[PDB]
């Protein structure tokens, strides 16, 4: 009820009642909000509404102070002062960017640009507002009910009339009814139940709309530079394996926070785990948004760090499987691996936040609120994929606007850059180096002579909006007959519907570009499927072709990206 101004910090009792997060505003800033926007409801212990019986005047510009009460122009007493006058709204202890964050619908790219270019408190206001908007949008969707059960993995659904149907992919996680979370993939639909239960007919699912908590901590803590390693104790016996990162590990101990840009296969988790060997007494918390990113850090830690000092933090609501080898939920172990939403309230000597392109400003802030650390390290790559922005439908979100860490990496550059790709055949490294890394990424591997490209537009069909290209899958099938070593390839495309078709026709394991991020395979077969902004996205393209260790086959739709691929072209 009585708090601090989200703009200039000048204490007040005035909260905007029209803002979905109800932020406190000072006398000066509340005025500049109500007179420039449709937002006219002003709060305190008592709201600014006409006290005269049965009067519906709530607009603060049409209200006045009659002693210690509030009334409109039609009900005010002779001795009454306007609540809105002289650039101020009457309150105790007596902006363009704040207005736009407060009133935008978050469907445009410019809304996200602003949410990242504004002041720090406006970043938290923006992150709270966006997350709250995203959750209330889930409520707009229709309830799905089980009509019949075909088998242990297939079912038929009945939808609510009037309310739209959400897109079916492993992106949208429903909550069965409390029979556990469930996901869907396309009249022959497949049901992916997180908890194994006999799919009851009549039982329904609904999109988990968790409540949005307020943000207290900043996205980035204030930067501190030191002239000596602070609170960390190095070794002069770090294995040659991690010696390439000694100068960077020291930079970590000489700054409050540091950023690491690591292109694919340049040694990000090797750097992250090697930081524990360089400061062997330090308590380190390894965090990331996804369970898969946390698990990939667990796998590297399992190889170099003592297993008895490790613990994998798993929340009670087990939404999918997790890394099994560390002791579970022992919050007190020297090494703690946990997702951002499951983080306990604790301290650390170092906090490592991985896959930073997937973080939102909300995630950056939660980490600063749940973890108080001597040093924070942000590992990721702004040339890789960002978190899906479900409300964003107009415009494209550039990497400098993914989050505060990405913004720093794209404007002032990263503190540390891993320049040598050790995963990919040089054809791939040379392509992405020119495409997204300003020719600064170098190849450790030779050219494999197993990277191919084919320009084939085929025929584009759609499953609602998720696209399919059966002729591009036909070309893959023909290629497989002539190149049987490729029988072990992973099939990748920008669309679930393309992947579902390729799975039945080719029999290859399937993966979307977005779900492939962080993973590597010997052989990759990629079909572009369409020439949309989604399938032409250079960060998505970069992720797609950098999954391969040995060979890649790219069936392309876009001439531009095809021409850039430094691969042997194939005929047909």
Ligand X SMILES: COc1ccc(C)cc1NC(=O)CN
Q: CB nearer to Zn ion: give 8 or 109.
A: 8
Q: Which does 7 bind (CB under 5 to 8 A by kind): ligand X, Zn ion, none?
A: Zn ion
Cα dist from 417 to 215, 247, 248, 420, 482, whole Å:
31, 12, 9, 9, 40
Q: Residue 327 in contact with residue 425, Cβ under 8 Å?
A: no
State the residue number with the nearest CB to ligand X: 566
470: three-class secondary structure by DSSP: helix
Q: Which does 52 bind (CB under 5 to 8 A by kind): Zn ion, ligand X, none?
A: Zn ion
Q: After which residues is the chain broken (C to N over 2.5 A)?
A: 94, 177, 186
Q: Which does 92 bind (CB under 5 to 8 A by kind): Zn ion, ligand X, none?
A: none
Which element (helix H / strand E) includes 405?
helix 404-411
Tell whether residue 566 is a contact of ligand X (CB under 6 A).
yes
Q: Which of 42, 43, 49, 50 binds Zn ion (CB under 5 A)?
A: 50
Measure the CA–CA gap between 418 and 164, rounded to whole angstroms: 45
Lookup result for tokens 């990939």:
296
Q: Which stretch binds ligand X (CB under 6 A): 327-335, 374-382, 506-514, 563-571?
A: 563-571
Q: Burial, 459: exposed, middle or buried (Cβ in 10 Å; 0-12, 13-18, 19+)?
A: exposed
Write out the binding residues for Zn ion, residues 132-151 only, by CB under 5 A.
Answer: none
End-to-end CA separation in angstroms for the chain: 70
Q: Which of 222, 568, 571, 572 binds ligand X (CB under 6 A)?
A: 568
Q: Which of 29, 83, 260, 525 binds Zn ion (CB under 5 A)?
A: 29
| CB of 560 vs ligand X, minimal distance in Å | 11
Tell whether residue 554 is a contact of Zn ion (CB under 5 A).
no
Write out the binding residues for Zn ion, residues 277-316 only, by CB under 5 A.
Answer: none
| CB of 100 vs Zn ion, minimal distance in Å | 11
Tell whether residue 564 is a contact of ligand X (CB under 6 A).
yes
Q: Which stretch binds ligand X (CB under 6 A): 55-63, 380-388, 547-555, 560-568?
A: 560-568
Tell whether residue 26 is a contact of Zn ion (CB under 5 A).
yes
Q: Which stretch binds ligand X (CB under 6 A): 304-312, 395-403, 483-491, 562-570?
A: 562-570
> In sequence order, which residues have a C-beta less than 8 Å from that of residue 439 and are 6 or more positions away?
433
Task: Write the interaction track for ligand X spanning residues 392-431; mark x where CB under 6 A is met and - where it is not.
Answer: --------------------------------------x-
Tell whether residue 445 is a contact of ligand X (CB under 6 A).
no
Q: Which stretch binds ligand X (CB under 6 A): 144-152, 161-169, 317-325, 561-569?
A: 561-569
CA 299 from chain centre, in angstroms, equals: 22
Lookup result for tokens 């084919």:
454
Q: Which does 186 bind (CB under 5 to 8 A by kind): Zn ion, ligand X, none?
A: none
| CB of 448 vs ligand X, minimal distance in Å | 13
Measure the CA–CA gap between 449 and 65, rounded to whole angstroms: 81
- DSSP conformation class of 222: P
Measure the CA–CA gap between 244 and 209, rounded to whole angstroms: 45
Q: Which does 459 bind (CB under 5 to 8 A by kind): ligand X, Zn ion, none?
A: none
> 3 is written with which tokens?
């708090």
> 129 is written with which tokens?
């507002």
Measure the CA–CA gap between 401 and 399, rounded to whole angstroms: 5
Q: Which residues carry a binding-site annotation?
A: 5, 8, 16, 19, 26, 29, 33, 39, 50, 55, 72, 75, 262-269
Which element (helix H / strand E) includes 75?
none
> In sequence order, which residues have a C-beta less than 8 Å from that of residue 569 and are 6 or more positions away?
452, 453, 454, 455
Tell whether residue 18 is a contact of Zn ion (CB under 5 A).
yes
Q: How does 485-503 read in b/e, with b if 16+ C-beta sit within 10 Å?
A: ebeebbbbbbbbbbbbbbe
Q: Residue 423 in contact with residue 269, Cβ under 8 Å?
A: no
Tell whether residue 16 is a contact of Zn ion (CB under 5 A).
yes
Q: Which does 296 bind (CB under 5 to 8 A by kind): ligand X, Zn ion, none?
A: none
Q: CB nearer to Zn ion: give 101 or 179.
A: 101
Q: Which of 339, 252, 349 is nearest to 297 (CA)?
A: 339
Q: CB nearer to Zn ion: give 34 or 544.
A: 34
> 70 is written with which tokens?
């509030």
Tell whether residue 52 is a contact of Zn ion (CB under 5 A).
yes
Write out the binding residues for Zn ion, residues 86-115 only, by CB under 5 A.
Answer: 102
Tell whether residue 408 is a contact of Zn ion (CB under 5 A).
no
Interface residue list for ligand X (CB under 6 A): 430, 564, 566-568
């Amino acid at each position: 009820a009585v708090g601090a101004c989200v703009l200039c910090n000048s204490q007040t009792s005035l909260r905007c009642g029209a803002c979905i997060r109800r932020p406190f505003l000072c006398c000066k800033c509340c005025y500049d909000h109500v007179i420039s926007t449709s937002h006219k409801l002003v709060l305190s212990v008592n709201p600014y509404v006409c006290n005269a019986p049965g009067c519906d005047v709530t607009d603060v510009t049409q209200l006045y102070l009659g002693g210690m009460s509030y009334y409109c122009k039609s009900h005010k007493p002779p001795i009454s002062f306007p609540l809105c006058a002289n650039g101020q709204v009457f309150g105790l202890y007596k902006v363009t960017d704040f207005n736009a964050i407060a009133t935008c619908d978050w469907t445009n790219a410019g809304d996200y640009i602003l949410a990242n270019t504004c002041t720090e408190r406006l970043k938290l206001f923006a992150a709270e507002t966006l997350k709250a908007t995203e959750e209330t949008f889930k409520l707009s969707y229709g309830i799905a009910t089980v009509r019949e059960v075909l088998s242990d993995r297939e079912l038929h659904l009945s939808w609510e009339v009037g309310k739209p149907r959400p897109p079916l992919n492993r992106n949208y996680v429903f909550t069965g009814y409390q029979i556990g979370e469930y996901t869907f993939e396309k009249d022959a639909v497949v049901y992916r139940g997180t908890t194994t239960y006999k799919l009851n007919v009549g039982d329904y699912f609904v999109l988990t709309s968790h409540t949005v908590m307020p943000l207290s901590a900043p996205t980035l803590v204030p930067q501190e530079h030191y002239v000596r390693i602070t609170g960390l104790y190095p070794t002069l016996n770090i294995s040659d394996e991690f010696s390439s990162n000694v100068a960077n590990y020291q930079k970590v101990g000489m700054q409050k926070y540091s950023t690491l840009q690591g292109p694919p296969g340049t040694g990000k988790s090797h750097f992250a785990i090697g930081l524990a060997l360089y400061y062997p007494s330090a308590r380190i918390v390894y965090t990331a948004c996804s369970h898969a990113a946390v698990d990939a850090l667990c796998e590297k830690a399992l190889k170099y760090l003592p297993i008895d000092k490790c613990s994998r933090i798993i929340p009670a609501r087990a939404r999918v499987e997790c890394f099994d080898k560390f002791k579970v939920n022992s919050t007190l172990e020297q090494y703690v691996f946990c997702t951002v939403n499951a983080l306990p309230e604790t301290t650390a000597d170092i906090v490592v936040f991985d896959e930073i392109s997937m973080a939102t400003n909300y995630d950056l802030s939660v980490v600063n609120a749940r973890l108080r650390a001597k040093h924070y390290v942000y590992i990721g790559d702004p040339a890789q994929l960002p978190a899906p922005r479900t409300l964003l439908t107009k415009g494209t979100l550039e990497p400098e606007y993914f989050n505060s860490v990405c913004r720093l990496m794209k404007t002032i550059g990263p503190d540390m850059f891993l320049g040598t790709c050790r995963r990919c055949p040089a054809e791939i490294v040379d392509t992405v180096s020119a495409l997204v890394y300003d020719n600064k990424l170098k190849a450790h591997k030779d050219k494999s002579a197993q990277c191919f490209k084919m320009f084939y537009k085929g025929v584009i069909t759609h499953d609602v909006s998720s696209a399919i290209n059966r002729p591009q899958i036909g070309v893959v099938r023909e290629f497989l007959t002539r190149n049987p070593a490729w029988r072990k390839a992973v099939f990748i495309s920008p669309y679930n519907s393309q992947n579902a078709v390729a799975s039945k026709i080719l029999g290859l394991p399937t993966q979307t570009v977005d779900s492939s991020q962080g993973s590597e395979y010997d052989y990759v077969i990629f079909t572009q499927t369409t020439e949309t902004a989604h399938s032409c996205n250079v960060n998505r393209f970069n992720v797609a072709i950098t999954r391969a260790k040995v060979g890649i086959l790219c069936i392309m739709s876009d001439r531009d990206l095809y021409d850039k691929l430094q691969f042997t072209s194939l005929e047909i």
